[PDB]
């Protein structure tokens, strides 16, 4: 898609992730872990809730009957009414198809952008202590335990602490 993350450089989604829309998986010495990112998940849901508030709505305009259901109306004005209603219906059918098509395009791309924005936030945090694998993972060039992994997710990772160790492991 537009931002190249979802159905892009991230191969597939995680069916096993049920407590969030976006999140992290890690591997270190101590083993494996999964966690959802709250901020990114909520930003996406709040934007979709916004669309629904705007679209799931009718006009409060009161319309009366201009055609009788049970009696015959004048043939000439009947033809005018039939022409006008069919014309209005063609406009609303077109507007409905376009609205939903356009919104669906935006929803898919907005969701793609929130994934990319989380990825870029992490890349910038890790600075020179990690490198990108092209599948959405960062290879970290220092011992990163569950506290360190938690500090990346919570946006409190200090790159300067591990820089010396990391730069040596990267150059080898």
């Amino acid at each position: 898609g537009l931002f190249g993350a979802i159905a892009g450089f991230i191969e597939n989604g995680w069916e096993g992730m049920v407590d969030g829309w976006y999140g992290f998986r890690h591997q270190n010495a101590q083993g494996t872990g999964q966690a959802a990112d709250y901020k990114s998940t909520q930003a996406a849901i709040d934007q979709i809730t916004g669309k629904l508030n705007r679209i799931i709505k009718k006009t409060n305009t009161e319309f009366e009957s201009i055609e009788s259901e049970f009696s015959e109306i004048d043939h000439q004005i009947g033809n005018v009414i039939n022409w006008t209603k069919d014309s209005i219906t063609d406009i609303w059918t077109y507007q409905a198809e376009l609205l939903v098509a356009m919104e669906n395009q935006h929803t898919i791309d907005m969701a793609d952008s929130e994934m990319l924005n989380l990825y870029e936030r992490v890349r910038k945090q890790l600075r020179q202590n990690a490198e990108e694998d092209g599948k959405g993972c960062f290879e970290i060039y220092h011992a990163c335990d569950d506290s360190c992994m938690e500090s990346i997710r919570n946006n409190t990772y200090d790159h300067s602490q591990y820089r010396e160790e990391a730069l040596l492991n990267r150059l080898n």
């Binding site: 159905a7 799931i56 006009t59 409060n60 063609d90 409905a96 919104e103 989380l118 992490v122 959405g136």
Partner: protein
Amino acid sequence: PDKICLGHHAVANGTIVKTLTNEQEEVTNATETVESTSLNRLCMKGRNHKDLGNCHPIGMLIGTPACDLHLTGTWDTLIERKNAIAYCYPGATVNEEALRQKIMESGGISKINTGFTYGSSINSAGTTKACMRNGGNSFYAELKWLVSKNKGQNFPQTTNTYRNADTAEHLIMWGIHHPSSTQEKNDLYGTQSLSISVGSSTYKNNFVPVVGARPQVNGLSGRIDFHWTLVQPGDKITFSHNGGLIAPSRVSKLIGRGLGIQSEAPIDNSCESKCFWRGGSINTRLPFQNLSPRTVGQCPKYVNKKSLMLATGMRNVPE
């Protein structure tokens, strides 16, 4: 080296939606924007409503037997039904659809006596077998069939005038009898040339009974055609007639505003609705609807579309 991987959720059973670019786009979740299901009921909760059943709105003004329980009333909603009776005696109303729309737009009907009196040479109690009431011959409750008291005798030149004493417009209706033969006409209103004149400030017209053979409708070749006008406050309306006039004993007053539904659906006083059609009520919060282009009230817009799915989640990419 230690790894941290970023990813998004997925689901096994995703939904197909349309985009600008792709007609078959799988997403995690989607919601419908077009209503396809109807309630085959009229949701009349919070509404002072009136089901006319077998009574046609015009029947309320002239007082057909079938309409005896609907001669007066107040309502915010009026329900008209299929094959509703307006005329017991064969005939029609000039500007029928305009009158029907005006009643269906109203929020009630009140009746006012005209006070019309007639000479002893006139019989005001003319009845027919077409309009049965309590098993016996009768006539329209709000009108009187004026005929010569003695068969064959000339109907006398009569003048009746109704003044609108109220502070709102009144709807006056009257009938013109068209007999089927010259013999019938002579028996009822005499041998003279018949002329009925109606005049107000804003309305004026003349009517001549059309005599001539025509088919029987409920075994009657006679016709009573109905006419109507509005009489404004303080204004008078004058009837000059020498026989053939079906004269109003009561005039009508249309009170406030209301919503007119034409439906076959039965009433339900439990559910609430602001949108109605022939087939029932539409309660959806959805913006669009493919039930009928003919709706009344505050309605979702009609579209020529079965389904329009709005995505409520990202692209679904499983393994």
